[PDB]
Design a binder for this molecule. Structure first.
Ligand code: SF4
Length: 73
C-alpha cells in the first residue's frame, strides 16, 4: 500500500543514508538499496521497495542500506 518511509534502524541495521552505515563493517562502499539484489523498484522521491517480508513493511530510501544487503552480482 502507501508504505511509510523507513526509520533509521527500522530493522536489520538499516540506514536512510547508505553512508551513515560506514561504521558497519559489512557496509562496502557505494552499496545502496537501489543496487541491492533485493531491490524492488523506486516508488517516489528517492524511496523504493525492498522485497523482503521484514523490510517491505516500510518503504526504504533508494539511497539507504541495510545488513541484509546482497550485491546484484
Ligand atoms: S535488503 Fe537492505 S539494502 Fe537491500 S534493498 Fe533491502 S533494505 Fe536495502
Amino acid at each position: 500500500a502507501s508504505e511509510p518511509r523507513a526509520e533509521d534502524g527500522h530493522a536489520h541495521d538499516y540506514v536512510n543514508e547508505a553512508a551513515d552505515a560506514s561504521g558497519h563493517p559489512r557496509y562496502q562502499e557505494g552499496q545502496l538499496c537501489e543496487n541491492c539484489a533485493f531491490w524492488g523498484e523506486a516508488v517516489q522521491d528517492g524511496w523504493g521497495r525492498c522485497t523482503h517480508p521484514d523490510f517491505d513493511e516500510v518503504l526504504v530510501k533508494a539511497e539507504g542500506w541495510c545488513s541484509v544487503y546482497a550485491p546484484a552480482s
